[PDB]
Amino acid sequence: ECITPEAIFIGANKQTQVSDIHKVKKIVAFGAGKTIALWDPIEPNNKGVYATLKGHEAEVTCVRFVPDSDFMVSASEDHHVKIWKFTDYSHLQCIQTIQHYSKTIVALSALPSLISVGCADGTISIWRQNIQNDEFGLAHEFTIKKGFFYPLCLSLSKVEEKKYLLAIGGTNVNVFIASFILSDSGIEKCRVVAELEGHEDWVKSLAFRHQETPGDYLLCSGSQDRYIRLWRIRINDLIDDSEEDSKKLTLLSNKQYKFQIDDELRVGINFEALIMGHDDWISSLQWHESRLQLLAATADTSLMVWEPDETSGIWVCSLRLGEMSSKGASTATGSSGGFWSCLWFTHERMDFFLTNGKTGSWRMWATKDNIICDQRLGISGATKDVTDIAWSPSGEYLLATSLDQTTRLFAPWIYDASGRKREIATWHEFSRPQIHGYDMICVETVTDTRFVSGGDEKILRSFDLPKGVAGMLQKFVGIQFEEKSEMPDSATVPVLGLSNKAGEDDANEDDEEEEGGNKETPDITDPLSLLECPPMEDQLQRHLLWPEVEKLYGHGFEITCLDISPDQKLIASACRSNNVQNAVIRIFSTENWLEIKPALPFHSLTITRLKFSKDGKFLLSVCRDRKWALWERNMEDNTFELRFKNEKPHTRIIWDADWAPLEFGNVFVTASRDKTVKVWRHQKEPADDYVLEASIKHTKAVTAISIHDSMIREKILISVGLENGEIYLYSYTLGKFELITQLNEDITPADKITRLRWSHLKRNGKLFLGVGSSDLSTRIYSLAYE
Template sequence: MLQIRTEYLAAGANRHPSTADWDESGILAFGADRNVALWQPQNEESRGVFEILSGHEDIVNAVKFIPGSSNTLLTGSVDKNLIIWKKNTKSGYWENSQTLNHQDSNYHQSSINCLAVAAGANIFASGAADGTVKIWSLDENNVASLRQSITVSPRFFPLALALSLLAGTTDSYVLAVAGTKDIIQLYVLDSEIGPEFNFKATLAGHEGWIRSLEFTRESNSPDSDLLLSSASQDKYIRLWRIHQGKELPAAAASADPSLGAFLPGKSLSNKAHRFKAQGLDFSATFEALLLGHEDWIYSTRWRSGNDKLQLLSASADNSLAIWEADSTTGVWVTITRLGEISAEKGSTTATGSTGGFWAGLWSPSGETVVSLGRTGSWRLWNFNVEQDRWLQGIGTSGHTQSVTGIAWSKEGDYLLSTSSDQTTRLHAIWKRGENKSWHEIARPQIHGYDLNCIDCLGTSQFVSGADEKLLRVFSEPKAVANLLSKLCGIGGSHIEQKPDAANMPVLGLSNKAIEAVDDDVEITNGNSNGRDAFDPASIVHKSTLDLSQPPSEEHLSRHTLWPEIEKLYGHGYEISALATSHDGSLIATACKASSIDHAVVRLFETKDWLEIKPPLTAHSLTVTRLRFSADDKYILSVGRDRKWAVFERDAEQKAIYKLKESDPKGHTRMILDAAWAPTPFPLFATAGRDKKVNIWAKEEGAADFTCKAKISETHPVTAVDFLDKMVRDGVAYLAVGLETGFLAVHSLNVKNGFVMQMLAVRLPSIHPNPSKAITQLAWKPVKGQTDGEVDMELAIASEDSSLRVYSYKPESSVS
């Protein structure tokens, strides 16, 4: 049996204003593709995601904790389903307690966009693109049943909901609904009349879609007025007051008409909307207009448990704003602005933009705020009382699309990953005393094409291939080398000879090396006619590159790029596979192909970056994987044409390879992956869509490779990889990943008739496997360890946008 432990989980958050919620227990849950990721932002160990929940079949849009119940979580998805998650008090892991499936025709029949809960309530609301709002009842065990369905289409589709108990009542609630129109609808549940919500008022004033609604009480008094915040794509926030009593609140009765001057040609309406509940009179009136953002506003959140009312807003203008009413005038003003406060907008440069903030959240204590950006990363700020200011802390990040390729550095010090989100990311362990935690330390490549494959080249270079016809080679800059040395204890060679950093020119795809300047150097932007004007992105101060903790999202995207040192041409279509030799002298590449002419393997030598001709021919369709054997004597290629081919190196000319052997019927369907084993004789595994893993070996004295063993799986096998050292005498470990996300480790005994055995694994959690296909597996290189004492770490890339690193340890009972 193998003991397994989760070392690292990375997943980027979905771009949706309702995709995250922060519970009073300190857990922040957010949608990550079709999964739900759990993170503790205020964890002193600065660990990122600690658990990933799988259950949905499509993108998770809405996430809400049940207030006062720190062990119940609601999630809604594009798959039209609602899931109620509960924390298992014994195991500590979260489990799917109930799925409200769209197959019931009374439930949602389209993508679920928003959820609303209220403290102490036994009901919650959900809104979907089917134009309905569903009201659900919860019993004492938090099991949900449908209570009411409200149709708001064809008027609009709900994008935001807010639910609250009405002041002075025991079980009467007000529900605010808004979405793809510029109005807010109020529905009221009067417990004396019946158990259903009834339409009471329409609040008008916004001029664009409304993306966020939230209620709060004006004070801690149970009879205090309710305030409703609404955030809109018209760049404004409006506050509305729900007051209990026949008299109108003072602000509405004496509204200053001159306030209309803020909006050209518009006046602010102070019309009172009256309704009753439990025999009490209520009025809903406009309270205030908050101006300050320069782009769409995606979310607003009230700070709880504070003497002063504060509102946090997140906007597409790349900023978070904290609003507070002035103590003398009562006018709402911005007291703090966080984020990227500059004239640089999202379309200016690829590295200078964040694309805006999609969500902002308060911590339960109100001492920390986080924001979600376009890149799926979370930024974090903590309030420092001594300095009386907000200081940026350590957030978490991850890919937002399928992770297509992973590669460990040659020494196994760090892990590189590429993705369809058009980024390459470097992950490593931040070491500080006894504490160790994984983080994204650098973002070497931000591209304009989806990235498909990657491999390391030497100790400080890598090559990547994308949906373009060329490959790009990158070299580590001094800034990243110093960061890895300082934070991770990874010693870089010849640091002083490297360029300081890199940047990407406007409208460019190639990272250019730049030099850092001292802090006291005065920078002038050319002469008066602008001829010598410079690109601000090309200037960076040395102090900016000197960090004492893992970089923030802004720093990652601006200052950790690697300069591009070479482009490799020759292919006619998108790059599909690449591999580098273990000695770093060769790069083998292939591209997507539907004919023999393009289904070739091209070799490039890394001394002068020239192609070695002629290319290697064996396949007729796309080559899906290339692998060099441990001694670089062989190159293995597999493809969609169901064929594998082995090329052997010339005994005298080390850069020349020739076809040694191939099998046109290696599998009955396309072959998706392959890997060499660390055996004394050539042995490799191939994985196919025919649900088979075949083991091929050429034993001593044999002329050809023959199939020695087969593993039959339940679904297509999409990834395989051998640990690069034998675990015991004659035993190799093979990791196998399936299209369903299932992961298994097999032992192969080459001394005992090539017997294959799936190893039992003690799982780290209820959901240890990805929820979509595993795209690539990579064992960490084993350094200087004797047989039988191997520390094994496996990196797992998946289509569900998650990147995982698991450590395996054989138990003594393993025979």
């Protein structure tokens, strides 16, 4: 008995020191939310994120691998720095914490047996570890200039066995350079020794290239003044001369910075060249290995590659990537969003350029030796809390909304472009349903290709399906969609999207095109160029939207919760409040989209859960005032009436309740902040009502529950989640709590769980479970229960 984590979904932050690679292994480890996610692009399988190292408390800012060693350091907004050591070939673990720095950390850079920390208090700290004990000891903590300086970026270089330098930039126009020499555990003779001139704004990027020829190398600098400049550095016996004791014309800007570091080492630094030609502030500068080239990212999302000019001596940009015009999610004119990080690496000879997007979407380009380029499959995910989940009626593609108005539409990849099954199927995002100004709290799926949603406005909306998406799914996820030809043609790109389009005003500008993978269900792709992978990041933001069908009013506040009748004819909805008259429910009919007159007044506080019975006869109502009710329906006019009620089930508020199948005889379960899970059974011998069977309690508050669709070996399944993030799987028959397992803390979403949902369409002898939490995460688990 075991599980298999099917998918992991998360989005990147908007900082600059987040990304990091390990060249010998090439494991992209980047911070996200309050954890550090791992990913690997070099694989025939495009799986994605597989593990999120946890342990922090606030948002992570700086992540750095120690170059060719066995450690990794992270820094978070919690005013803390954490150490990690390889515990497995592809897994790490926290080993040490740092208890200094009441203020946060902004800059981070490290070389073996040294840690550089820039505390926004205004201080710079240098650490050196011990010979035999892995606790990185403290060597020095100093300040460049109190009161008027704040660091932004740091860097390091090893001059010799025991001699090192250090560069500092930030809220000024000069680049400071200090030096120090090694000792037993501490550092001595450490002070600022050079103040290079240059830019007219804040220093933002530093880069020390390796030493090809010993003692002489180059430093690059970029600033908010849109210009990039260079500085050449030489060791003694190669320092440029004739500055002293020679009749020559010294210019104002060609000053040479010489320093006698020690009794035997003197370094000379000069200015070399000025590089410009950009549209916004520089954000990332990265070196190379086999060329004198640099990668430049701006705030306009533009990407430039700067190369030396053997003809004119002044470096000219080699390649310019990112000509697509896109600002934010809604594009009107110009482009914006920028690139807030970068990585550059080649496997054999395909160069790879990866950058973080504006909505937590990695964008990665492969290229054939500086000539031609092509975008490969990236990653996408949520950037805020994940509230509500909803499966497909058939047991298919799920919808998982969030607080950042980015509706999701995932799907499994089973047709692997070879006409056969992928040996190991992988999940990906296949459609982005809707975007708008509000938060899109609640969403529900009624039929195979229809859904009803509601955010923080007082209205509910019902949407439709375009054509291209239908064919694209029936190609890649493949599963047959019957009578899909009745749907009319839709569009792809709206200038501003309250929803997509379902009319004759526009059309689709992509032709029917099977570019690749034509060996499974050929000519199923509705007009589009058939990819070799799920839709691209350039396509997700402006192509895969679903048009809206109907609007419907009725509430007096923002939408809280709704549910769909099993007959797919009736729907119930309700908004939150604490007054008696604003805690009612309103119902609508799908064939006419109209309100039914009578009201359902029973509660005085916010409605928490709305759930019809297994048959369209009863409706469950649960709230926070610890009162629950069951209402009966008249099949003639679909109206309702109150039948069953109870007023003292718990002491703390009730969070979630779920039903039971028709086989076992209409049982239900309630979960409340009393950490109490109570099971309610039916009995009618001495009185026709619902009775109490048993209950269980945990150490922390329960948050959501889910019960499997059917029964397995005269017992059913149960899932319970906490606000600590753990998940418990249970087997249960009448009166018997047969605990299955507690899910691993090494896989759980660290924050409060919000919604757990069991799927029904079993395939490969296993079932699926969808987990949505407020940890900026949405996960899929598999159950191959025997």
